[PDB]
């Protein structure tokens, strides 16, 4: 959203003129500057008509530049808020309207009803066709096609959605291509994660993070010590000679307190949230984003997250007593009813490659056995053959429960299937074992480099799989992760959460399944996927719109950038004050202590020029550092000591040096312009 | 001269580092609730007789214990000083103190400040000196070391609520660290020539025919504890300039060693209790670098000395005014830096007669919060406050959560660290301003102008920072000065002790998470420089305008 658009700047400047009266006292440093500006304005009015000092022009210039300092700090805050509001309003402009096809019965083609957007609740069934905008988010119960999510994600290539599979939920405001998707409503419109983020951005009542609160406490303490020194300077010089004027004291106080970071804190926070939004990541609050910069372990589900899913039968090794035209029939009889994308792919390719389409799909006495994650069972008892299939451990458990035994050829076949990375899956009649059907999975692509970057960040990435141990090892070696955890129940993921949190290590994770809700609830960072379900998106504190597993790179980038921008600007503001002393103190004490003029190492022209130059630099450093606060600091992955040393050398030394040059240049410009 | 100064600093630091390491191990054993060898049995029967149980209080009851002991000592000492003319051991028949002087002296000796707005040999009796003043010299030091024991236990304890037994800590410190070491130091002082008796004031027939009255009393017993507990409460008005308190150069070397002995041993004990000795070495490196820079600056300023001496016919510009002749200006400068950095009120030399820079650097060293070995316990927890500030800044600049020794730094600890940092500069600035707007606060001045403002600022800084060292040209015996300084000492001790105990109670509940690859090493030259820069920059940004209107103005005059 550009850097400084003309309309954004001109509207938010009027906003700055509108956030003067009561938006100032929430910020203590800027309320101190506001009070000093008002006091210096009244002092200048008294000097003009009603007070014995006659230098009303100098006090007027000081008051005007203090008001300009307040205006530039509010300009930083308003520019950040306006950029965030512009991004949220651009994302708000979807074509989600009152066009819908309500269905009283969830079958296809029900009454062709038309209902408005407000007449929608938690429980509803809607239909969409080709080129239709999605009214409300929800899982798809019938049909499947390509859904173009360009208007939400920011990138094209329609995603493939399947009825009740891994890609079940659909994002609202997205066009529908090719076939139809019968969609049952999950959550009523207006209550969406996108809607909550839009409401949080527009009308910015953003809650401060604990890190921002602690930094605000530190800035308040610095404001208190600087106010104490400034206030006590009046009697200290009053006894020594002529008392120092109040306007010079107020100017020194404003130049002393952390004006830069104190005016740019809200800009840093809102710009960090806007950069989070620009990475196609929705965040509930900044607490999770700032906590993401402290995590050391990332948890990963295999299918859906690190891989595209949609497993297909490729090798299809049979057994000795199966030969041909039996394994496909057993697979179809076991997989005709379970609502999983790999099962549907097996169904639509087994009859395709074996010409076994003559088998009926409905026979009026189907058991309709569903699929449970922990049991790993699927199959229909249709002819007292009670056919089932599942993972290797589940097959061994079911054979050891009723059947006799298994020979070594089944182990050899599942090992050969897991050699190339495809997960093993074997069918059994119940008393005898059969051939092994493979399920090929495709890696998401260029993820080895991003996992190397995660390893360079010091985050020990580890993927929780289930499935089979050897194929988990193969896919872990192919992906490039540090470790893996196979044969996992859904309780084991929460167990790993609590085990990593028992060490004190802060844990991050990504997931897109509906069985991961306690995991994303207990996780500190719970980045969901756009392809994930509504329950997982609601349970997660953050959701990714790119459907990318290693979006934690960008999240860690933005969180560390926010924290280092805050710390660097605080260090810069603190280090500027020695040059503020060297500009103001010999200038402030020139008649009561002319012997202090030796401290004017900057060789400034006049005391009034020196004080004015210090105030001008204090006003201008905020508007010069608006782009730095908006873009964040340059984050490079190094060790902690090296990063601290680089940030110190480029910010503390910068605050030691740069204000000297700035005050000197401002003084020379004033001298050659003849203003003072 | 520079070679002699370098040799003096190197010898002093080497002997201090050699001596403070076995005491560091003993203090680490005291922190870890392990009784010292040979103390078992007698310690148990003493605890049974005193009625202290095996209870283990939390931070609230620990702080209430320390505050109650301090208030009881304050009441006892105040009544002892008010009614000292009824108590025995008064050969001079010295009358009882006034209400303001007694209140100031009581708060002064309870708050480990030991400011003295009186002459000891003219004002106080022997029983008062050896029975209220010495017992408060022991008790305030024991209270400070008990508070830092609580803070170190909070840093080393994992997800508990208790903080040790406060009475057991106080008794262990006083009986096994303070009393025997002070006994040895006092015996060495007596051997060198310090005073320890109870005779009346001896009459002397001067050789030329005059008559001087020599004060007597148990000087060495109080001298040992005022050295050991960073106390600095002089038996006489001359303090450590008096030959009855500090007779020899070897005695003064032992004096400086005893001043720095317990803060350095506490840093070593902290490093050993946490297991990583690099933390204690980091703290000691920071204090040692700042201390060496300050010592070099002060000796350079004092060797430059009075510029008018060669104009008025003198061998050298060496600032020997207000300095004892048995000690060089290098030794006097070193002692001045040691006492004004270590929160000790002892003076080898009148700091009022020091030069402008040689009075600024001691006064700025008090004003930065007494973190360069700044007192028994008090210096270590003030340095801990600055370490939490530094690790907050470092965690911000590295993008991680603020972290020190495995424990998180959160909003509550930042609030309490900020308040504890805020207490003492607030007291210094407001007390100096109140003295500078009042005729009672301005009529006590002796030197005119910027050095008189330096006198007022030095007095308020030493009162609020629990130092007690004075220019002594200020006439602080007025009721206004007594009450103002007593308020400064009371708040600058207890309103820093209370939030440190609150930080300890906030940090006991947390768990020390183990280090990782991304963690920041809280040691090494990078963090030493960061902590030094934080301390010096915070103290500078607080106090440069005051220095500019005082000692900098005097220097540039």
């Amino acid at each position: 959203a550009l850097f400084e658009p003309t309309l954004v700047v001109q509207a938010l400047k009027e906003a700055v003129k509108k956030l003067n009266p009561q938006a100032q006292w929430r910020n203590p440093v800027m309320f101190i500057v506001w009070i000093g500006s008002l006091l210096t304005t009244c002092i200048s009015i008294a000097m003009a008509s009603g007070a014995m000092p006659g230098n009303a022009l100098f006090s007027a210039a000081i008051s005007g530049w203090l008001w300009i300092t307040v205006l530039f700090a509010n300009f930083a805050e308003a520019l950040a808020e306006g950029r965030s509001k512009a991004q949220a309003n651009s994302l708000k402009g979807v074509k989600k309207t009152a066009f819908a096809r309500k269905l009283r019965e969830p079958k296809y083609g029900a009454a062709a009803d038309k209902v408005p957007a407000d007449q929608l609740r938690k429980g509803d069934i809607v239909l969409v066709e080709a080129g239709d905008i999605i009214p409300c988010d929800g899982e798809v119960i019938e049909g499947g096609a390509s859904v173009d999510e360009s208007a939400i994600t920011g990138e094209s290539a329609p995603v493939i959605r399947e009825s009740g599979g891994d890609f079940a939920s659909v994002t609202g405001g997205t066009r529908i291509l090719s076939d139809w998707l019968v969609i049952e409503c999950s959550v009523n419109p207006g209550e969406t994660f996108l809607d909550r983020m839009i409401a949080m951005v527009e009308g910015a009542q953003r809650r401060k993070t604990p890190n921002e609160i602690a930094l605000t406490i530190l800035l308040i303490a610095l404001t208190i010590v600087f106010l104490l020194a400034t206030a006590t300077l009046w009697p200290f010089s009053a006894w020594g000679g002529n008392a120092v004027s109040v306007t010079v004291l107020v100017a020194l106080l404003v130049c002393l307190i952390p004006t830069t970071i104190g005016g740019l804190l809200s800009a840093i926070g809102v710009a960090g949230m806007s950069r989070m939004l620009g990475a196609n990541v929705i965040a509930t609050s900044g607490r999770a984003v700032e906590a993401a910069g402290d995590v050391d372990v990332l948890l990963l589900d295999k299918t859906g997250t690190i891989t595209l899913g949609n497993r297909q039968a490729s090798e299809f090794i049979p057994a000795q007593g199966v030969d041909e035209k039996t394994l496909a029939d057993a697979a179809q009889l076991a997989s005709l009813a379970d609502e999983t994308p790999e099962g549907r792919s097996i169904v639509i390719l087994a009859k395709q490659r074996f010409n076994l389409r003559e088998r009926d799909v409905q026979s009026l006495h189907a058991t309709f056995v569903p699929f449970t994650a922990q049991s790993r069972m699927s199959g229909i008892n249709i002819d007292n053959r009670m056919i089932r299939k599942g993972s290797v451990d589940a097959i061994r458990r079911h054979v050891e429960a009723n059947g006799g035994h298994f020979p070594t050829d089944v182990d050899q076949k599942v090992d050969q299937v897991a050699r190339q990375g495809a997960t093993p899956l074997v069918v059994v009649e119940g008393s005898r074992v059969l051939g092994v059907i493979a399920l090929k999975d495709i890696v998401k692509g260029g993820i080895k480099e991003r996992f190397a970057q995660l390893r360079k960040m010091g985050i020990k990435t580890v993927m929780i799989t289930g499935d089979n141990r050897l194929t988990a090892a193969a896919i872990a070696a192919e992906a490039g992760v540090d470790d893996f955890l196979a044969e996992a129940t859904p309780e084991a993921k929460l167990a790993l959460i609590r085990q990593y949190q028992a060490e004190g290590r802060l844990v991050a994770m990504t997931g897109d399944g509906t069985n991961d809700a306690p995991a994303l609830a207990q996780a500190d960072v719970a980045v969901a996927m756009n392809s994930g379900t509504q329950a997982a998106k609601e349970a997660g504190n953050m959701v990714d719109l790119d459907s990318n597993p290693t979006k934690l790179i960008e999240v860690v980038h933005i969180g560390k950038q926010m924290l280092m921008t805050r710390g660097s600007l605080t260090t810069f503001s603190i280090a500027n004050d020695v040059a503020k002393y060297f500009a103001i103190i010999p200038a402030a004490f020139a008649a009561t202590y002319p012997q202090l003029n030796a401290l004017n190492i900057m060789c400034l022209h006049s005391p009034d020029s020196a004080i004015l130059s210090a105030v001008i630099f204090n006003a201008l450093i905020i508007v010069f550092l608006i782009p730095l606060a908006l873009k964040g600091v340059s984050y490079k992955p190094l060790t902690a000591s090296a990063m601290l040393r680089r940030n110190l050398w480029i910010y503390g030394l910068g605050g030691l040096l740069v204000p000297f040059i700035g005050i000197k240049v401002i003084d020379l410009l004033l001298t050659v312009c003849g203003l003072v | 001269m520079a070679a002699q100064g370098f040799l003096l600093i190197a010898t002093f630091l080497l002997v201090l580092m050699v001596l403070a390491r076995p005491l560091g191990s003993g203090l680490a054993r005291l922190i870890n609730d392990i009784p010292l060898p040979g103390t078992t049995g007698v310690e148990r029967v003493l605890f049974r007789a005193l009625g202290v149980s095996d209870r283990e209080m939390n931070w609230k009851q620990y702080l209430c214990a320390i505050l109650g002991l301090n208030m009881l000592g304050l009441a006892v000492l105040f009544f002892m000083l008010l009614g000292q003319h009824y108590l025995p051991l008064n050969p001079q028949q010295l009358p009882g103190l006034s209400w303001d002087l007694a209140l100031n002296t009581a708060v002064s000796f309870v708050t480990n400040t030991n400011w003295q707005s009186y002459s000891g040999e003219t004002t106080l009796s022997y029983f008062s000196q050896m029975a209220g003043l010495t017992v408060q010299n022991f008790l305030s030091a024991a209270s400070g070391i008990a508070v830092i024991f609580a803070l170190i236990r909070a840093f080393t304890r994992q997800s508990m609520s208790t903080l040790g037994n406060a009475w057991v800590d106080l008794l262990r410190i006083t009986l096994w660290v303070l009393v025997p070491v002070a006994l040895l130091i006092a015996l060495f002082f007596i051997q060198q020539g310090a005073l320890q008796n109870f005779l009346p004031y001896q009459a002397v027939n001067t050789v030329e025919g005059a008559q001087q009255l020599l004060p007597m009393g148990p000087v060495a017993s109080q001298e040992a504890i005022k050295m050991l507990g960073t106390n600095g409460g002089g038996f006489f008005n001359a303090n450590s300039s008096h030959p009855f308190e500090n007779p020899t150069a070897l005695t003064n070397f032992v004096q400086m060693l005893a001043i720095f002995l317990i803060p350095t041993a506490l840093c070593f004990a902290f490093g050993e209790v946490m297991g990583d000795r690099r933390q204690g070495r980091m703290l000691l490196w920071a204090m040692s670098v700042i201390f060496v820079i300050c010592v070099g600056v002060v000796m350079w300023a004092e060797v430059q000395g009075n510029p008018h001496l060669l104009a008025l016919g003198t061998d050298s510009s060496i600032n020997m005014e207000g300095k004892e002749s048995r000690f060089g200006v290098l030794v006097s400068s070193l002692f001045a830096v040691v006492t004004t950095a270590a929160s000790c009120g002892a003076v080898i030399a009148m700091h009022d007669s020091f030069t402008a820079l040689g009075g600024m650097v001691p006064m700025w060293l008090m004003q930065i919060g007494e973190v360069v070995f700044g007192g028994v316990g008090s210096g270590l927890y003030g340095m801990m406050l600055f370490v939490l500030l530094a690790v907050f800044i470092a965690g911000l600049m590295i993008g991680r959560t603020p972290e020190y020794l495995g424990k998180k730094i959160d909003v509550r600890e930042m609030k309490l660290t900020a308040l504890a940092i805020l207490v003492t500069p607030t007291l210094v600035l407001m007390g100096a301003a109140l003295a500078m707007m009042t005729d009672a606060g301005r009529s006590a001045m002796l030197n005119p102008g910027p050095h008189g403002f330096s006198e007022v600022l030095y007095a308020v800084s030493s009162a609020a920072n629990n130092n007690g060292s004075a220019f002594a040209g200020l006439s602080a015996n007025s009721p206004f000065w007594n009450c103002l300084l007593a308020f400064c000492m009371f708040v600058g001790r207890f309103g820093v002790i209370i939030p440190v105990m609150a930080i300890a109670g906030s940090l006991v509940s947390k768990k020390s998470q183990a280090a990782s690859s991304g963690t920041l090493p809280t040691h090494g030259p990078l963090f030493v420089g960061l902590l030094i820069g934080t301390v010096l920059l915070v103290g500078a940004l607080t106090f440069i305008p005051a220095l500019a209107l005082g000692p900098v103005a005097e220097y540039l005059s």
Partner: peptide, 27 residues
């Protein structure tokens, strides 16, 4: 000492009270 000094002392104490309030109640 005078009305102006009284007003300045009162304003400084009010600002200090506001800043201490903001530090204690930093939401």
């Amino acid at each position: 000492m005078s009305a102006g000094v009284i007003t300045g002392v009162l304003l400084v104490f009010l600002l200090l009270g506001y800043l201490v309030y903001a530090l204690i109640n930093a939401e």
